[PDB]
Homo-oligomer: A and B are copies of this chain.
Amino acid sequence: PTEFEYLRKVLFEYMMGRETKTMAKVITTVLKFPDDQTQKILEREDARLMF
């Protein structure tokens, strides 16, 4: 309930293109993504920072 509002806030920021790398870590953490998927997201994200 409080985590849902938290989730939406974080997800809103990410989708609008802000501080996307940090938000990605909280999103995979809150929704307990598996290690494989998590690392796949965190890398493309890094490959995104290059710009």
Stoichiometry, copies per complex: 4
**Count of chain A residues with a beta carbon within 8 Å of a chain B beta carbon:** 21
Other-chain residue from B12, B37, B48, B50 in contact with A33 (beta carbon distance below 8 A):
B12
**Contacting pair B31 A15 (CB below 8 A):** no
Other-chain residue from B11, B40, B47 in contact with A51 (beta carbon distance below 8 A):
B47
CB-CB < 8 A to A51: which residues of B?
17, 47-48, 51
Interface code A28-51, partner B: CB below 8 Å = 1, 0 otherwise?
A: 000101000100110011011011
Q: Which residue of B lies closest to A34 (CB)?
A: B8
Q: With both chains docked as a complex, state the minimum distance between the C-beta of A19 and any C-beta of chain B, in angstroms.
A: 14
- Complex CA distance for A23 and B17, rounded to whole angstroms: 15
